[PDB]
Structure formats: structure tokens, C-alpha cells
Amino acid sequence: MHHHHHHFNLPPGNYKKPKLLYCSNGGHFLRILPDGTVDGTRDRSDQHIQLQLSAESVGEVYIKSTETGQYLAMDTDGLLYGSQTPNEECLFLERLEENHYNTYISKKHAEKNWFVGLKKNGRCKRGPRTHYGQKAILFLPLPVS
């Protein structure tokens, strides 16, 4: 294993069932819209917030929309998008944080600590704007309906 210059505290659980990824920062579920944009919604019955995680190798995940099949990805300038096909920008290091939450670090940009993050207004943060210590990067995985 490479550790990619990060800790290796992992959250409990498996990838058997889909999840909601809930961010208490603004109270949003991570959403991958069919046009490829990514944001958050407070609408718990939205049909684009159900996500299937899968593990490449241990602690490295794909995050896929169950509705559209799109993969969460982060591009070269730190913007989240939904990708039709899996590529190196779709891999995230899923780690435990504060002994409690899940965080997701872009594997491609792991050396810069670019996280998946949702602002209080439900918009995505750009990679460079995310940091340890922010509520924006803290997620709770929740069972779907």
C-alpha cells in the first residue's frame, strides 16, 4: 500500500448499500445532477442524492450516482463534476475525521488536501478553498430510504 502521505484512519461500514452523504455545515445532501453539475440540497427526497460508494483498493472510493450512473470527480482546477466514465479524477481517499465523520480527499490532488466540501449555501467548495477544520468537509453517511 502507498498511504499517499495521509493518515489511514478509516470509518466503519461497507459498500453493500447506497448512502446519502449529509453535510451539517449548511444541512445539505451531496447531489450529482444529470447535467454533470454537483451541489447540495436540503431536500431529503431529491432523487439525485442517492450514492453508491465502491472501493478500488482499501480506503480509495468511487462515489457514483445511483440515478444517472455518473461518478463524482474533481477537475484540475478543483471543481467537482459528474463524470460519465471512471477516471483518475474520480478516486477519493475516504477517511475518518474527529473519530466521527467521513472526509473525502481527491486522490489525484491529495498532496494539496483538496476535499469534497459543501458551503453553508449548498454550493460546492473549490478544492483549494477546502481545509481541515472546516465544517464544509465533514460528511455523515446515511442509509437511503
Cα–Cα separations (whole angstroms), residue 19 to 13, 52, 126, 145? 11, 6, 23, 9
Tell me the three state secondary structure of residue 82: strand
Q: Which of 44, 27, 120, 38 is nearest to 79 (CA)?
A: 38
- Burial class of 19 by CB neighbour count within 10 A (0 to 12, 13 to 18, 19+): buried
* Residue 62, φ and ψ in degrees, nearest 5: -95, 145
Q: 134 forms bridges with which residues in the sheet?
A: none
Q: Residue 25, annotated ligand binder?
A: yes
Instruction: Give the integer Cα–Cα distance in Å for 69 and 96.
Output: 26
Give resolution in angstroms: 2.0
Strand 28-32, strand 38-41: pairing: antiparallel
Instruction: Give the integer Cα–Cα distance in Å for 2 and 77.
Output: 25
CATH number of the 1-145 domain: 2.80.10.50
Instruction: Give the integer Cα–Cα distance in Å for 50 and 108.
Output: 24
Torsion-angle region of 112 (φ positive above 0: left; ψ -120 to 50: alpha; else: beta): alpha
Torsion-angle region of 99 (φ positive above 0: left; ψ -120 to 50: alpha; else: beta): left
